[PDB]
Amino acid sequence: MRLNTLSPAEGSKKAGKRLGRGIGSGLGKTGGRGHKGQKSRSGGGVRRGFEGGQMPLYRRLPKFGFTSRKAAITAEIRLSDLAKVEGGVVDLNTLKAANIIGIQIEFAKVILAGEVTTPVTVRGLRVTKGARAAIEAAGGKIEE
Amino acid sequence: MELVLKDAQSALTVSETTFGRDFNEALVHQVVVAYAAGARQGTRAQKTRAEVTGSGKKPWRQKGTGRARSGSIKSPIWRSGGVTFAARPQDHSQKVNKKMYRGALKSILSELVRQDRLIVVEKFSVEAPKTKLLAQKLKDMALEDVLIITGELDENLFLAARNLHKVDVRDATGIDPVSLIAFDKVVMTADAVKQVEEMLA
Amino acid sequence: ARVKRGVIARARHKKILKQAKGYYGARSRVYRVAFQAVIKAGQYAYRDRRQRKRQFRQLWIARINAAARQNGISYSKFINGLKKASVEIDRKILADIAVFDKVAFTALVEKAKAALA
Amino acid sequence: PKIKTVRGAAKRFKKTGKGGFKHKHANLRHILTKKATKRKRHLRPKAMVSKGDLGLVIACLPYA
RNA sequence: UAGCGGCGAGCGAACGGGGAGCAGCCCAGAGCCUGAAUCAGUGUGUGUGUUAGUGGAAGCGUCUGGAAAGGCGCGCGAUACAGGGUGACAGCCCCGUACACAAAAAUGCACAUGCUGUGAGCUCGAUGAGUAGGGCGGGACACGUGGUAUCCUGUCUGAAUAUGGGGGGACCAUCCUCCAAGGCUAAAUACUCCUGACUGACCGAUAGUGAACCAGUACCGUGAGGGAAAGGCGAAAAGAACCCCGGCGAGGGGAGUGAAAAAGAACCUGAAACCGUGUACGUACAAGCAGUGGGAGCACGCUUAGGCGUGUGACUGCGUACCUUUUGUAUAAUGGGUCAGCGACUUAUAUUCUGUAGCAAGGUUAACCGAAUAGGGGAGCCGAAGGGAAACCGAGUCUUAA
RNA sequence: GCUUGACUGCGAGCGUGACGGCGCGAGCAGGUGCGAAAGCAGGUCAUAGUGAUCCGGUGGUUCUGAAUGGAAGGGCCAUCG
Ligand SMILES: [Mg+2]
Ligand SMILES: [Mg+2]
Ligand SMILES: [Mg+2]
Ligand SMILES: [Mg+2]
Ligand SMILES: [Mg+2]
Ligand SMILES: [Mg+2]
Ligand SMILES: [Mg+2]
Ligand SMILES: [Mg+2]
Ligand SMILES: [Mg+2]
Ligand SMILES: [Mg+2]
Ligand SMILES: [Mg+2]
Ligand SMILES: [Mg+2]
Ligand SMILES: [Mg+2]
Ligand SMILES: [Mg+2]
Ligand SMILES: [Mg+2]
Ligand SMILES: [Mg+2]
Ligand SMILES: [Mg+2]
Ligand SMILES: [Mg+2]
Ligand SMILES: [Mg+2]
Ligand SMILES: [Mg+2]
Ligand SMILES: [Mg+2]
Ligand SMILES: [Mg+2]
Ligand SMILES: [Mg+2]
Ligand SMILES: [Mg+2]
Ligand SMILES: [Mg+2]
Ligand SMILES: [Mg+2]
Ligand SMILES: [Mg+2]
Ligand SMILES: [Mg+2]
Ligand SMILES: [Mg+2]
Ligand SMILES: [Mg+2]
Ligand SMILES: [Mg+2]
Ligand SMILES: [Mg+2]
Incomplete structure (x- = not known):
């Protein structure tokens, strides 16, 4: 193991393309840009979504819906996250302390995702009917 | 696993995951390369056609003169013109995952004990900060090119090694991947190896 | 890392x-003209490695035709006679015999005339 | 600098589960009196972006 | 992201979180106590800088060579093997370097102290009006007048005044929160004409500053302004005494110096185009991209009877340059007089995919801290759940009375 | 003659388009007309009679509502320029 004996992994350091360096390179004299036109020019090319003048897709379709400001303060909690909490009893504060939900989360819902093994006391959280059964099946307790 | 000391002739137990794992050359190579990149200063620059001192005046009119059309005396085609893609001061430092860095040290340390390039002693010190003493001590151990790693950095040992070219001392926390590879032998005190294990989990 | 091109270009x-x-x-003096001349020379050399095989066979056939008519038979009937006689000497050798050994060539004509008759 | 989303596209395409995009149908803003109820009914539900147009949408919504 | 936006191109927050840094005060007024905190000015002393400096270790022999610092041998110093120079590459020749010291005088910063000015503390009062707000016209807020809060004001108006007023994004009620129309305030931040030290996977004379050189010069322009070219003898000038040709020239030949003068100042190396002298061969009856295949003869090197190599090339088959652009070019379409040097897919940040490496239902930190590539820092970001415009529900959900 | 199927929600499966789209459609649910009944009817023998998006209007709406209750505005459904 010397400084002049270390070698990178096979196929991890592919060489980059070098355009316009002769015929043998396969990329000479045009750099793979074709012959003429807008796309062959330096800085050439059309912007995103441009379709040649036809009404682009994101303009011929209607806008729909609105953004809910309550969805930004609502999170979902998996069953597998109930064991990461400290103390057993879970609420908004204990989930935030465990870095499970964001600091600005005001509403939290436990869903049937993952699996819970220890008795957990859920307090002040909405629980799906599937997760409610799984929590009670592990000796847990749900209180509003 | 046991690391036999050179003088006390007693074994020293160490974690097998730290000193007895396989050598991941691809992993070590990336960390060694990234360490060299971190040493780069990257202080350089050239002048584009915008920074070259000169006038924006058109050297001659567009048509009629019979010469190739020109627009600026600073053009990169011209002598004394700018550089087409003039360099800027850049930062060559790469990111190394914490686990990839620590994973490379374990692969290097485990490789050293496999090459018998790692020597473990109970203690290593000199009385006065005199390079003559340290040079004599290493000759007794048949060592010329060696990296010495101690638990606490002693000033006398540090001063005595400053002028020795093929020798350098290092704290237990100051080890780096390229130093462990660059030197022929690596001498670690029993205190240093203990501190290295805590560093590498 | 500036790279001067002088050494490798020369x-x-x-x-x-x-x-x-x-x-x-x-x-033979200036690079622009010499480079075209060398490329053209390589093209001709490639083409003429194929033409050489045609020109020499064309020469052998002509010499065989001359030597055969000295013995009273054309090249066409002479080649057809040899194939009917199951002789497989190629034209490079026949032209060689026709020049350096007349009596052996006459013996071949007799063999060819027999297979025809 | 970060890529900027085409905000007009963000108000018209929603990313679905398997990476596709849903969108509202056209032809349902005005002039419905002359349109057959069957035609208008089939335009109410959201539709998926066709395979030929996914390249345009993905380019416009890099963070979707 | 939320938003703004011919809802186009584009523009683009805040709340909140993590860090660096952290400092609070005065007037709109009397009184009591009083000159008490504090700051400034101005001295003094102490400390630490800065402006000259001082000391600073340790090697010889032999070989090659013009020259030793190189080779070989045997020593020595090192808190000094940074660096530079010295007749080739020096730890020990020199200058330095590590380290240890040094100021008559001026001066920075601290401290302490004196002087001068400055006023602390307490009680009781007071609480910024053509102002807030409004109409009209503009502007600023990410926010283009929109349902448009908030801020500024050119114009016209115009309150309440703590039993009061402002804000919480039209607006109202409730609640919460703050007190405008008077000021001051260090640090964390931005920058480098300039000074010193140090560093470079920066340049090395068409590069790097325009300028390595007496360069913003020569030169150009009425002027503003524009703006070059141009580095290298040798270790040391030891820069060629003297002689000869020549015009008491230029230039040259000797001599001499030197390791070298084919290093002679038009001076290291000395390429190519281009121009010559000499030799070998060809060439004055022969038609064209000038080569290529075949090939005699001649010259020469051989070996040697090897019958091979090299140069030339009578004669002969075939054969209309290159690039670009084109359906298509010998084209009489474009471009190139030639040579030498330079001259064009980069960089940064995002994003996606592939490869590869680490870890894996987890992965990873950012700023920042840190004798700092370590370690700390998990603020965050992505992923493990989706459906719906949304409330919401959730391995389902939406659609619908179903 | 009698009538309002020129129905509401859907829709197996196809046709035709680069796409935006356009077209055909048995059957299912709800409710209805004609017929004694089997049945037929989601406009007209078929193929032309048309205009994306934005912006805005009108009606509805067990959606949203920037401290909270409302509202404004927005969304969704129907429809207009
Ligand atoms: Mg093209
Ligand atoms: Mg071209
Ligand atoms: Mg074209
Ligand atoms: Mg967090
Ligand atoms: Mg330049
Ligand atoms: Mg780190
Ligand atoms: Mg053939
Ligand atoms: Mg509508
Ligand atoms: Mg001295
Ligand atoms: Mg000395
Ligand atoms: Mg409000
Ligand atoms: Mg409070
Ligand atoms: Mg220059
Ligand atoms: Mg040069
Ligand atoms: Mg200039
Ligand atoms: Mg210049
Ligand atoms: Mg003279
Ligand atoms: Mg020279
Ligand atoms: Mg002749
Ligand atoms: Mg011909
Ligand atoms: Mg043309
Ligand atoms: Mg073509
Ligand atoms: Mg043409
Ligand atoms: Mg042709
Ligand atoms: Mg031409
Ligand atoms: Mg011509
Ligand atoms: Mg022309
Ligand atoms: Mg021309
Ligand atoms: Mg029915
Ligand atoms: Mg009936
Ligand atoms: Mg009809
Ligand atoms: Mg509200």
Whole structure:
């Protein structure tokens, strides 16, 4: 193991393309840009979504819906996250302390995702009917 | 696993995951390369056609003169013109995952004990900060090119090694991947190896 | 990391100019003209490695035709006679025999005339 | 600098589960009196972006 | 992201979180106590800088060579093997370097102290009006007048005044929160004409500053302004005494110096185009991209009877340059007089995919801290759940009375 | 003659388009007309009679509502320029 004996992994350091360096390179004299036109020019090319003048897709379709400001303060909690909490009893504060939900989360819902093994006391959280059964099946307790 | 000391002739137990794992050359190579990149200063620059001192005046009119059309005396085609893609001061430092860095040290340390390039002693010190003493001590151990790693950095040992070219001392926390590879032998005190294990989990 | 091109550029210009030794005028002196002359010379050489095989066979056939008519038979009937006699001597050898050994060539004509008759 | 989303596209395409995009149908803003109820009914539900147009949408919504 | 936006191109927050840094005060007024905190000015002393400096270790022999610092041998110093120079590459020749010291005088910063000015503390009062707000016209807020809060004001108006007023994004009620129309305030931040030290996977004379050189010069322009070219003898000038040709020239030949003068100042190396002298061969009856295949003869090197190599090339088959652009070019379409040097897919940040490496239902930190590539820092970001415009529900959900 | 199927929600499966789209459609649910009944009817023998998006209007709406209750505005459904 010397400084002049270390070698990178096979196929991890592919060489980059070098355009316009002769015929043998396969990329000479045009750099793979074709012959003429807008796309062959330096800085050439059309912007995103441009379709040649036809009404682009994101303009011929209607806008729909609105953004809910309550969805930004609502999170979902998996069953597998109930064991990461400290103390057993879970609420908004204990989930935030465990870095499970964001600091600005005001509403939290436990869903049937993952699996819970220890008795957990859920307090002040909405629980799906599937997760409610799984929590009670592990000796847990749900209180509003 | 046991690391036999050179003088006390007693074994020293160490974690097998730290000193007895396989050598991941691809992993070590990336960390060694990234360490060299971190040493780069990257202080350089050239002048584009915008920074070259000169006038924006058109050297001659567009048509009629019979010469190739020109627009600026600073053009990169011209002598004394700018550089087409003039360099800027850049930062060559790469990111190394914490686990990839620590994973490379374990692969290097485990490789050293496999090459018998790692020597473990109970203690290593000199009385006065005199390079003559340290040079004599290493000759007794048949060592010329060696990296010495101690638990606490002693000033006398540090001063005595400053002028020795093929020798350098290092704290237990100051080890780096390229130093462990660059030197022929690596001498670690029993205190240093203990501190290295805590560093590498 | 600036790279000056002087050393390697002169090396490859000399490599071309060395292959152009003996060409007339600028074709052996200046690189732009010598390079075209060397490429054209390579094209001709590739083409003529195929033409050489045609020109020599054409020469052998002509010599065989001459020597055969000295014995009273044309090249056409002579070749057809040899195939009917199961002789598989090629034209490079027949033309060689026709020049350096007349009596052996006459013996071949007798063999060819027998297979025809 | 970060890529900027085409905000007009963000108000018209929603990313679905398997990476596709849903969108509202056209032809349902005005002039419905002359349109057959069957035609208008089939335009109410959201539709998926066709395979030929996914390249345009993905380019416009890099963070979707 | 939320938003703004011919809802186009584009523009683009805040709340909140993590860090660096952290400092609070005065007037709109009397009184009591009083000159008490504090700051400034101005001295003094102490400390630490800065402006000259001082000391600073340790090697010889032999070989090659013009020259030793190189080779070989045997020593020595090192808190000094940074660096530079010295007749080739020096730890020990020199200058330095590590380290240890040094100021008559001026001066920075601290401290302490004196002087001068400055006023602390307490009680009781007071609480910024053509102002807030409004109409009209503009502007600023990410926010283009929109349902448009908030801020500024050119114009016209115009309150309440703590039993009061402002804000919480039209607006109202409730609640919460703050007190405008008077000021001051260090640090964390931005920058480098300039000074010193140090560093470079920066340049090395067409590069790097325009300028390595007496360069913003020569030169150009009425002027503003524009703006070059141009580095290298040798270790040391030891820069060629003297002689000869020549015009008491230029230039040259000797001599001499030197390791070298084919290093002679038009001076290291000395390429190519281009121009010559000499030799070998060809060439004055022969038609064209000038080569290529075949090939005699001649010259020469051989070996040697090897019958090979090299140069030339009578004669002969075939054969209309290159690039670009084109359906298509010998084209009489474009471009190139030639040579030498330079001259064009980069960089940064995002994003996606592939490869590869680490870890894996987890992965990873950012700023920042840190004798700092370590370690700390998990603020965050992505992923493990989706459906719906949304409330919401959730391995389902939406659609619908179903 | 009698009538309002020129129905509401859907829709197996196809046709035709680069796409935006356009077209055909048995059957299912709800409710209805004609017929004694089997049945037929989601406009007209078929193929032309048309205009994306934005912006805005009108009606509805067990959606949203920037401290909270409302509202404004927005969304969704129907429809207009
Ligand atoms: Mg093209
Ligand atoms: Mg072109
Ligand atoms: Mg074209
Ligand atoms: Mg967090
Ligand atoms: Mg330049
Ligand atoms: Mg780190
Ligand atoms: Mg053939
Ligand atoms: Mg509508
Ligand atoms: Mg001295
Ligand atoms: Mg000394
Ligand atoms: Mg409000
Ligand atoms: Mg409070
Ligand atoms: Mg220059
Ligand atoms: Mg040069
Ligand atoms: Mg200039
Ligand atoms: Mg210049
Ligand atoms: Mg003279
Ligand atoms: Mg010279
Ligand atoms: Mg003749
Ligand atoms: Mg011909
Ligand atoms: Mg043309
Ligand atoms: Mg073509
Ligand atoms: Mg044409
Ligand atoms: Mg042709
Ligand atoms: Mg031409
Ligand atoms: Mg011509
Ligand atoms: Mg022309
Ligand atoms: Mg021309
Ligand atoms: Mg029915
Ligand atoms: Mg009936
Ligand atoms: Mg009809
Ligand atoms: Mg509200």
